[PDB]
Amino acid sequence: ATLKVIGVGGGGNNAVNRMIDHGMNNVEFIAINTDGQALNLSKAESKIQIGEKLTRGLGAGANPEIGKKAAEESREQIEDAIQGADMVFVTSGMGGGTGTGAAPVVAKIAKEMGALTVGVVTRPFSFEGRKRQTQAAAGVEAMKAAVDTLIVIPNDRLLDIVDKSTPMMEAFKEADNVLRQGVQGISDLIAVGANLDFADVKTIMSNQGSALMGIGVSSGENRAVEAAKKAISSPLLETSIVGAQGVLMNITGGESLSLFEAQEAADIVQDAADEDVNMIFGTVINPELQDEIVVTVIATG
Ligand SMILES: Nc1nc2c(ncn2[C@@H]2O[C@H](COP(=O)(O)OP(=O)(O)OP(=O)(O)O)[C@@H](O)[C@H]2O)c(=O)[nH]1
Ligand SMILES: [Mg+2]
């Protein structure tokens, strides 16, 4: 199962850059932008400049019409970069011209090509003003129409987890962890073996609206509950787990992994989930983990 991560627009490229720098592997990174200079600064293995004839290598100047038109004209390049992917993550900051306009097009192409398509986008800080926000909301609507599952990160949530002195790059790295947990969560679920596979992923995620993808790690007596609570919690997400209609859940531990622990973790997630939840639950024994427990949760709907 091949995973690709596609960053669209300035924010998208920045996320790709920060994540490649902090060493993601066995994932293909693709950078797409109208802005030629941005692309030159990209560490991404595969780069696509869109809308050359529109912008002459400039950005979209906050015009979403441009980003959309640029993406549509480069359909052939975009398809070619995508082909072979089983699952695609399109990441982008909403509110500008390139991301807002081109990211839904990129996402729609991937979904039409048959890839399981996940969007991870940001809404701008309130201080960026009412017009940026409104424009971003249009982006979010378009993304939601184009993806299998969408994950929205309001940039304002970053303000809630920093103090007066927290460096901006650290804050942005926190936001990157949202996409990171999603990507390694899948990669592990598909890795041999959890008695779970990509077919399970597709059942839980295909056409499911919104998604949460989390990983919790813990130890000690309350380890199972603690790991699970970590996995289903993030203050950066617009979407809580309550009412989920689909859950893919895996618990990994050493030989000490008890049946009661698995039940405890599963009950944590099950309480939050809707009565008619489609839950696919897996367990993996990995002696390497010693006293550690790892809980992975993908929730949708
Ligand atoms: N979390 C996070 N958000 C970002 C980052 N960079 C930009 N954003 C957000 O994304 C929104 C869009 O900014 P850009 O991605 O730079 O704009 P663009 O998509 O390239 O569009 P144009 O520059 O007009 O062509 C901004 O309003 C910010 O709120 C980033 O590095 N991290
Ligand atoms: Mg730009």
Curated annotation (Swiss-Prot):
> What's a GO cellular component annotated to this UniProt protein?
cytoplasm
GO terms, biological process: division septum assembly; FtsZ-dependent cytokinesis; protein polymerization
Where mainly found?
cytoplasm
What cystine linkages occur within this chain? none
Q: Name one GO molecular function term.
A: GTPase activity
The entry marks the following residues as binding GTP, namely: 10-14, 18, 60-62, 97-99, 128, 132, 155, 176
Keywords, alphabetical: Cell cycle, Cell division, Cytoplasm, GTP-binding, Nucleotide-binding, Septation
Q: Where in the cell is it found?
A: Cytoplasm
Control of this protein's activity: Calcium ions inhibit the GTPase activity and promote the polymerization of FtsZ.
Coiled coil where?
Answer: none
Q: From what superkingdom does this record's organism come?
A: Bacteria
What functional role does this protein have? Essential cell division protein that forms a contractile ring structure (Z ring) at the future cell division site. The regulation of the ring assembly controls the timing and the location of cell division. One of the functions of the FtsZ ring is to recruit other cell division proteins to the septum to produce a new cell wall between the dividing cells. Binds GTP and shows GTPase activity.
The family assignment reads: Belongs to the FtsZ family.
What does the subunit comment say?
Answer: Homodimer. Polymerizes to form a dynamic ring structure in a strictly GTP-dependent manner. Interacts directly with several other division proteins.
User: Know the name of this protein?
Assistant: Cell division protein FtsZ
The organism of origin for this protein: Staphylococcus aureus (strain Mu50 / ATCC 700699)
| Gene that specifies this protein | ftsZ
From the entire protein, which fragment is shown?
12 to 314 of 390
